[PDB]
Design a protein around this nucleic acid. Structure first.
Length: 1346
RNA sequence: GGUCCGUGUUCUAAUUGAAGGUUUUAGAGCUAGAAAUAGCAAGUUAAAAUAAGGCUAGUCCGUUAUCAACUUGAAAAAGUGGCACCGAGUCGGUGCUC
RNA sequence: CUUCAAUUAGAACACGGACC
């Protein structure tokens, strides 16, 4: 009952836990059941798992939420214009807005008249005939001096502000091809002085305005420059600028091809591979090639009048008509049978389907391309297709490229056009123009009043905000200053005050000063610097020299004042690593010593650095600089702006003057100065028990208390829901086993993040070698997962050790060879593996490949290296063979590369555990480690698992994850127990760092595995195996009881320590718990479904009708609930007791949670139970008679609640025939297992029986079950390896959660869906604690109302 | 090897501006036919909504994080489940402590 | 409910300089 070990299998989806004894075993306790079930007590084996859905990234939120701002800010300019325009709108027509706002409702509910534009039938059609789309009306105002009807002005300007086009252009609009093409060559010619270009003569506008296909257009420009072919670099530079996909593989002498698109998302990424191969050059020639390309894009939409956009938009439109009317005739004449579907069917992707139907321009367009070819005369309209310019809708996705300047001008023109006629229009021109120019800046964020957490803004004055007065009512300095401060860490040492980058310098001088010990000649004993000695030292030496030397100290100070002719300084280097530099920064510029030595200004001089450190805009500094101008000149001011300070310093200011030592009355900074004869360090000042500082800190630095300190970390939020829940598992254990602080604890995090590489790495190598062995014997893509078949082609069909051409059929005789032996490091990597007829020929075993083979065939190895068949490491190691002995550190690197991960995540949680569990401290100011927190790397965990015949199959059961929690658990222990000598490098505590030499031993294998120096070999797993295949072809054993020599403790006995493991995993019951989670998400799927008359559709708002206005559907419901109460059934509304589940749409939780009963009543339920119901998140575990279990689903929906248990004998089989090749490694170890592969056709039948019995028992998908059994019979005759993996997939109908679709050769078995929740209320129900060992079980057939 | 510093790159946490997908209507459809239905005509755009909605009425906030169950506790957060062995189809039994 | 862009924070890769 005393000494236990526990380990983990951290996972993004999985959380595995086990409870071993210190001797390796699982216990078998009995625990009680909560509820009203005749199952009082239960027997649980200690290990179990907890699975979950992973933690979400706030990006999903982020896109919906910022958008909710614009979607309401959009109408915040729309609302804004009405009011300036509200006054005279009333006189022209009383109801125009009160007719606009009501455009959705059908006329009868809708206010006023169904024609919003005019309210009268005749005129609205009259408008649509002069101007069908608004660009017609948009330009008409710009063209016509004649005053138009006011209403027309309003509608015209709405389409301007709502769709202003991006602000990505910073200024007033220099953007023609003409200006931004000559910058691509003036820098390209700047890029290449020699090898120049001519730019005077070239015309770009006439060549690059043209809508004609790009392919001729890129060709078209080169003929205007004889120098560069289209492949030629410049010629590709434009190709990118055109938006095509050009390849810089030829362009520079680059092995790896580079296809880049200006257009694509990844362009940034792909190109940044290139600027990393070119060195940081040509960011100009590619940005201006984007400038150009972007100055290319706009000219598509500018094809004399003032409104170019309008003109251009009309041009597409009449073009839309000319070709459209042109077209109908050809179908109706040449092949008229397809006119039927083209124009009428919105589902067909015919034209009608493009214009109103869901099909996007792409879908319609792709549909048209084969059609054209059959018709005659088509190709000219097809010319518009290649452009993709044919029959354009005005509003589309490419409309995404406008800047706000293009919209502005016609607005500003439109204003100029009608201002004279509506007087109030010209005076709000300024204001109205400002509605467009306004941009909520990035650095101001939102604009709250401080009642929402996100806004950081501060308002100089308080009044309702407008875009007109935005600049008057906002401190830019505080919107901006705040922006950086929130995201800048406060001190690592004081979390309650921002870090520095004067004080820190004022501190740093004094801190180093304290430890100086001076001995004049007289001094009998070396004494510290006296306090007054400091103030004399600060005044002169540090306020006149940047770095002050030891020689300065003697000469400047010791001779002059104290007349220590000779003297010794023993505390410090010659020149002080600290300095009064920021001080010295100001004397050069402000040049008023008496101003800085002054103490009063110390608050200001510090106030001023932050205000400098924060701002990155030279202008911006001015914003908060001005207040202090009335104290100095302007020429200092212009001298002042320039200087900049950054960096976030190690210390806080409220440590320095905020705390006080209540007894002594001295701050730490006050204390460093003048500490009396016993000067003391600042790090001596943190732990001094006489002083209030260690105890004043303790109240501060725990104010935060765990949802808080872990979400302080950084990384994927998927594992954040791991770590928070992983810790949560840990404490439930001490409840499972009596609040006991354990001996050791093992953690591991598996890594989060191939058939085609294998065939691109062979093709370029028989091409630069030039050989014909690729043309002598041919292969495929899906065959090179065979390492014997993939090590013939990396050695060019010639031996790697013997230089005979390799046979091509009998590879089962040739032998796998790791270059460096498996007793040093265990390598299945591609590079270490070499194929030869004979494993040994690489020479002596204990050594790496023999020195004799390096003299003969070194060159052949070097020969391949140039063809990228083998990595550099592969070659590098075989010269080490030639070189001689792998370094002790190379050996020592093998451990460090085996020893510990580098992911910081495995570190900052092990402090949490240190902090979390090792609460107790000793009375000597140190930390007790009764719990040794072990950090493992999975490959070691995995390799042993694979090394010693225990498999992981993800497909069969979640047991594999929970084992990994166990398997981790044992190994962390057995390491701190056999080698307590390396505890520092992996466990989270200060410990002993000796690795390089002791583990190294020379020449001792037989009594050197017992010396102080534990292991001559590098491999850390060797002792567990009874013997290690001593390198190549020789074998050396390991003593059967393995134990650390020093421990005098059986770290390991080979005979039986495994017997626990093999039998432990054999444990039939592992706890399996699915965290019930209150559901989260949107009220419904975002799509607005057509008008229909089905109840399920959700009204878009309270007024709206689903039966008439459609909207949402498939509403999602956070917790299902169980209720008993009578309901009305029979037109006489007779009372009838019932029992039926219900799903509570997260939409209705707010209505439900506060007042469940009333929400129950509005639904029509009556005689509501008082506090009988259960709140169940999804994933609730049911239990039925016969062991059937079920997991919660919302309506007549249920998934599998029963897991599959499997015997071990069957698991080790199933992966040997899964991995029939790529086993490689040791052939002899392979073959004794290989006998087994065809040896036991029988055990799978028992499996086939093991497999089948579960389906009749639990899932009762009796109609689905039958099909799968037949399919094995289809392939039953076939050899086992191929069949064996076909039944691995078939567990996915037997694997947890809902039935899935799963392949079986050409036979596919659809997923099974359960349509009714009715069955589980008769059943027993479950409530699972997070450990799942404890239970709350409610018999559900007792609670009912007749 | 470490620190710090520049830059570029990607990803994750926040801010801002742009283009959409969609639903209702406005967009009168016209020729012949009892009508149903044949034949032609036109089609691009515009408003309003983009989670219901809530109070603090903000140019706010609403899809992140958190949740086994019980006893409290308004919530947070504390408290609630015998041991030593034999063994295994999801856990049995055994016997000690109760 | 897709996409694109501005600004800042952190983590992982390439290059240069300063210190140990």
């Amino acid at each position: 009952d005393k000494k236990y070990s526990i380990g983990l299998a951290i996972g993004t989806n999985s959380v595995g836990w086990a409870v071993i004894t210190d001797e390796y075993k699982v216990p078998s306790k009995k625990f009680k059941v909560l509820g009203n079930t005749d199952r009082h007590s239960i027997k649980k084996n200690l290990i179990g798992a907890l699975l979950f859905d992973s933690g979400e990234t706030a990006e999903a939120t982020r896109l919906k939420r910022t958008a909710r701002r614009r979607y309401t800010r959009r109408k915040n300019r729309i609302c804004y214009l009405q009011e300036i325009f509200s006054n005279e709108m009333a006189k022209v027509d009383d109801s125009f807005f009160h007719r606009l706002e009501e455009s959705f409702l059908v006329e009868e509910d809708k206010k006023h008249e169904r024609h919003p534009i005019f309210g009268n039938i005749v005129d609205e059609v009259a408008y649509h005939e002069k101007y069908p789309t608004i660009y017609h009306l948009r330009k008409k105002l710009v063209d016509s001096t004649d005053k138009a009807d006011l209403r027309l002005i309003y509608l015209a300007l709405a389409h301007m502000i709502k769709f202003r086009g991006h602000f990505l252009i910073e200024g007033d609009l220099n953007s023609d091809v003409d200006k931004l093409f000559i910058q691509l060559v003036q820098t390209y010619n700047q890029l290449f002085e020699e090898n120049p270009i001519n730019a005077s003569g070239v015309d770009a506008k006439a060549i690059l305005s043209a809508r004609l296909s790009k392919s001729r257009r890129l060709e078209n420009l080169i003929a205007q420059l004889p120098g560069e072919k289209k492949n030629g670099l410049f010629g590709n530079l434009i190709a990118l600028s055109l938006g095509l996909t050009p390849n810089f593989k030829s362009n520079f002498d680059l092995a790896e091809d580079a296809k880049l698109q200006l257009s694509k998302d990844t362009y940034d990424d792909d190109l940044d591979n290139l600027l990393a191969q070119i060195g940081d050059q040509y960011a100009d020639l590619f940005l201006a090639a984007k400038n150009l390309s972007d100055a290319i894009l706009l000219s598509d939409i500018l094809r004399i009048t003032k409104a170019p956009l309008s003109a251009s938009m009309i041009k597409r439109y009449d073009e839309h008509h000319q070709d459209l009317t042109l077209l109908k005739a050809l179908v109706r004449q040449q092949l008229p049978e397809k006119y039927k579907e083209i124009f009428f069917d919105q589902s067909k992707n015919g034209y009608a389907g493009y214009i109103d139907g869901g099909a996007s321009q792409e879908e319609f367009y792709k549909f048209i391309k084969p059609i054209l070819e059959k018709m005659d005369g088509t190709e000219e309209l097809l010319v518009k297709l290649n452009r993709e310019d044919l029959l354009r809708k005005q509003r589309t996705f490419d409309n995404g490229s406008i800047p706000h300047q293009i919209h502005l001008g016609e607005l500003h023109a439109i204003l100029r056009r009608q201002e004279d006629f509506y007087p109030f229009l010209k005076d709000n021109r300024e204001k109205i123009e400002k509605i467009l120019t306004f941009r909520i800046p990035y650095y101001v964020g939102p604009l709250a009043r401080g009642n929402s957490r996100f806004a950081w803004m501060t308002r100089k004055s308080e009044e309702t905000i407008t875009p007109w007065n935005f600049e008057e009512v906002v401190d830019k300095g505080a919107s901006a200053q705040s922006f950086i401060e929130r995201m800048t860490n406060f001190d690592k040492n004081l979390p309650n005050e921002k870090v520095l980058p004067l004080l820190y310098e004022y501190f740093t001088v004094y801190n180093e000063l304290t430890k100086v010990k001076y001995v004049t000649e007289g001094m009998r004993k070396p004494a510290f610097l006296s306090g007054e000695q400091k103030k004399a030292i600060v005044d002169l030496l540090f306020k006149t020299n940047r770095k002050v030397t030891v020689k300065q100290l003697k000469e400047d100070y010791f001779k002059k004042i104290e007349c220590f002719d000779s003297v010794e300084i023993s505390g410090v280097e010659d020149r002080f690593n600290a300095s009064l530099g920021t001080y010295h920064d100001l004397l050069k510029i402000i040049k008023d010593k008496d101003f800085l030595d002054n103490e009063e200004n110390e608050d200001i001089l510090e106030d001023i650095v932050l205000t400098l450190t924060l701002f990155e805009d030279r202008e911006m500094i001015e914003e908060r600089l001005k207040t202090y101008a009335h104290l100095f000149d302007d020429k200092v001011m212009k001298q002042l702006k320039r200087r900049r300070y950054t960096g976030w310093g190690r210390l806080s200011r409220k440590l320095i003057n905020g705390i006080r030592d209540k007894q002594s009355g001295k701050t730490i900074l006050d204390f460093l100065k003048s500490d009396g004869f016993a000067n003391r360090n600042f790090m001596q000042l943190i732990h001094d028990d006489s002083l209030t500082f260690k105890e004043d800190i303790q109240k501060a630095q725990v104010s935060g208390q765990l949802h808080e300190h872990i979400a302080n970390l950084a990384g994927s939020p998927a594992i954040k829901k791991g770590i928070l829940q992983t810790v949560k598992v840990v404490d439930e254990l001490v409840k499972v086993m009596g609040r006991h602080k354990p001996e050791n604890i093992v953690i591991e995090m598996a890594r989060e993040n191939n058939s085609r590489e294998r065939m691109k790495r062979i093709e370029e190598g028989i091409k630069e070698l030039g050989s014909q062995i690729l043309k002598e014997h041919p292969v495929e893509n899906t065959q090179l997962q065979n390492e014997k078949l993939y090590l013939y082609y990396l050695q060019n069909g010639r031996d790697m050790y013997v230089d005979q051409e390799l046979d091509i059929n009998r590879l089962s005789d040739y032998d796998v060879d790791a270059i460096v032996p498996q007793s040093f490091l265990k390598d299945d990597s591609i590079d270490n593996k070499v194929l030869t007829r004979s494993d040994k020929n690489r020479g002596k075993s204990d050594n790496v490949p023999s020195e004799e083979v390096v003299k003969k065939m070194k060159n052949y190895w070097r020969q391949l290296l140039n063809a990228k068949l083998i990595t550099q490491r592969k070659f590098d190691n075989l010269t080490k063979a030639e070189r001689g002995g792998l370094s002790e550190l190379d050996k020592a690197g093998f451990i460090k590369r085996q020893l510990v991960e580098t992911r910081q995540i495995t570190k900052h949680v092990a402090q949490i555990l240190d902090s979390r569990m090792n609460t107790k401290y000793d009375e000597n100011d140190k930390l007790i480690r009764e719990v040794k927190v072990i950090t493992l790397k999975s490959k070691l965990v995995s390799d042993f698992r694979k090394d010693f015949q225990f498999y992981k199959v993800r497909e069969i059961n979640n047991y594999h994850h929970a084992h990994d929690a166990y398997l981790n658990a044992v190994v962390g222990t057995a390491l701190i127990k056999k080698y307590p000598k390396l505890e520092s490098e992996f466990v989270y505590g200060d410990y002993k760092v000796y690795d390089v030499r002791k583990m190294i031993a020379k020449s001792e294998q037989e009594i050197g595995k017992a010396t102080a120096k534990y292991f001559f070999y590098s491999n850390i797993m060797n002792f567990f195996k009874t013997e290690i295949t001593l390198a190549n072809g020789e074998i050396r054993k390991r003593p059967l009881i393995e134990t650390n020599g020093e421990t005098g403790e059986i770290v390991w006995d080979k005979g039986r320590d495994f017997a626990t493991v093999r039998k432990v995993l054999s444990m039939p019951q592992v706890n399996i718990v699915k965290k019930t989670e209150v559901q989260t998400g949107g009220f419904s799927k975002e799509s607005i479904l057509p008008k229909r008359n089905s109840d399920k559709l959700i009204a878009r708002k309270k007024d709206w009708d689903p039966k008439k206005y459609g909207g949402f559907d498939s509403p999602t419901v956070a917790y299902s609930v169980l209720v008993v109460a009578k309901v009305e059934k029979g037109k006489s509304k007779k009372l009838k007791s019932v029992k039926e589940l219900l799903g509570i749409t997260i939409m209705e939780r707010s209505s439900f949670e506060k007042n469940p009963i009333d929400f129950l009543e509005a639904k029509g339920y009556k005689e509501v139970k008082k506090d009988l119901i259960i709140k169940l998140p999804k994933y609730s575990l049911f239990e039925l008679e016969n062991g059937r279990k079920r997991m919660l689903a919302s309506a007549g929906e249920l998934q599998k609640g029963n897991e599959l248990a499997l015997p071990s004998k069957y698991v080790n089989f199933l992966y040997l025939a899964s991995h029939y090749e790529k086993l490689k490694g040791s052939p002899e170890d392979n073959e004794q297992k290989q006998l087994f592969v065809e040896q036991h056709k029988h055990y799978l039948d028992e499996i086939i029986e093991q497999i089948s019995e579960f389906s009749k028992r639990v899932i009762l998908a009796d109609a689905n079950l039958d099909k799968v059994l037949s399919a094995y019979n289809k392939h039953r005759d076939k050899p086992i390896r191929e069949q064996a993996e076909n039944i691995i997939h078939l567990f996915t109908l037997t694997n947890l959660g809902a039935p899935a679709a799963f392949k079986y050769f050409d036979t596919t078995i659809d997923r099974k869906r359960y349509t009714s929740t009715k069955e589980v209320l008769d059943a027993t129900l479950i409530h699972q604690s997070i450990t799942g060992l404890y239970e709350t079980r409610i018999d559900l057939s007792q609670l009912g109302g007749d």
